[PDB]
Amino acid sequence: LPEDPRWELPRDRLVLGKPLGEGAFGQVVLAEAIGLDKDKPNRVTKVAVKMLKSDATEKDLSDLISEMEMMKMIGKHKNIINLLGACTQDGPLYVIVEYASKGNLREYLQARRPPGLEYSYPSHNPEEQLSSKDLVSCAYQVARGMEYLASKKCIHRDLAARNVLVTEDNVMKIADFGLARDIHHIDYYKKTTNGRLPVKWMAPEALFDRIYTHQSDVWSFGVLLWEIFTLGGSPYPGVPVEELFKLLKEGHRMDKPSNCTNELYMMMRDCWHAVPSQRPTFKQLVEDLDRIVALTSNQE
Ligand SMILES: COc1ccc(C(=O)Nc2cc(-c3ccccc3)[nH]n2)cc1OC
């Protein structure tokens, strides 16, 4: 591997800790980086470190390098997982990225659901709660991250609350935007770690015609809005792949969540326009969401 001094961190400056990943986005450990920034070299930063498994192939290594390379080209934004450094020389490749202490958006929302009642699946009682303005702010931050990625000509292809990470400061950060586009596939029947089907976030033209655009990421963002307003709800529970295809061919759309305004449901429906050119762009969604955040009550 060739050395890039823009990103090189000496190996003795990384203190590897507990695994974080294989929960989702590859082989990942939590770590402490000493002196990531030149001002100063005496401070530690908790970081996430992406690396290869023992049974990794030449394609497994080339995909990690490409993801790292893509992150360098995309550059920095507050609403994406940023690249912080790399250990490329004299040992296993380590890709150092931002650590989001509150986990993914689906987990974060589920843990903040209102307390369990006598009819619930009843002991659920968080010490953490979200207002309607907080939920709209979450949607705004994801749209901002996507608008930035789109401005850098990046098409995500897998936007979902599972790929949005939450920092200690409740900042939303889009993850997995730099992953290498697989060829051909993918397995429509392959489930996530929590038993969900990624096809449930895919635009019909991406699913049926294999056409991925910024417009198909806007469809995914509509499903992500639905995930926000259901506080981490699962789209189409109990619906297998073959039945989802039939619902899509019939123009079926998910029902309005109860914790949602008519305006926000019409935003979801607009993201789900059958005609890709008719969907709002991320630039429009950012503008609409900024206006809505300012008018949404934080009193309930
Ligand atoms: C308190 O619970 C949790 C706290 C933190 C995590 C977590 O994984 N954080 C994480 C993962 C990455 C990363 C970003 C991009 C690529 C690879 C990894 N950055 N930050 C998971 C948790 O529960 C499962």
Author numbering: 465 to 585, 587 to 765
Question: Which of the paper's sentences describe this entry?
Answer:
FGFR1 is a membrane‐associated receptor tyrosine kinase which plays crucial roles in human development. Over‐activation or amplification of FGFR1 has been found to occur in many different cancers including oral squamous cell carcinoma, 13 breast cancer, 14 and lung cancer. 2 The protein kinase core has a bi‐lobed structure comprising a smaller N‐terminal lobe and a larger C‐terminal lobe connected by a hinge region. In many cases kinase activity is determined by the phosphorylation status of specific threonine, serine or tyrosine residues located within the activation loop that is situated between these two lobes.
First, to define unambiguously whether the compounds used in this developmental study were type I or type II inhibitors of FGFR1, the X‐ray crystal structures of the FGFR1–ligand complexes were determined. Of the ten compounds tested, seven bind to the ‘DFG in’ kinase conformation (compounds A to E, JK‐P3, and JK‐P5) while two induce a ‘DFG out’ conformation (Ponatinib and Linifanib) (see Norman et al 20 for relevant PDB numbers). JK‐P3 and JK‐P5 were originally designed to bind to VEGFR kinase using the in silico de novo design programme SPROUT. 22 Both JK‐P3 and JK‐P5 were also found to have cellular activity against FGFR1. JK‐P3 and JK‐P5 were designed to bind in the kinase hinge region of a ‘DFG in’ conformation. Specifically, the indazole (JK‐P5) or pyrazole (JK‐P3) nitrogen atoms are involved in hydrogen bonds with the backbone carbonyl of Glu562, and the backbone amide group of Ala564, whilst the amide NH forms a hydrogen bond with the backbone carbonyl of Ala564. Type I inhibitors bind to an active conformation of the kinase, in which the activation loop adopts a conformation amenable to phosphorylation. This is commonly known as a ‘DFG in’ conformation due to the configuration of the conserved aspartic acid‐phenylalanine‐glycine motif present at the N‐terminus of the activation loop. The type I inhibitor with the lowest affinity was JK‐P3 with a K d value for FGFR1 of 25 μM; the weakest type II inhibitor was Linifanib with a K d value of 37 μM.
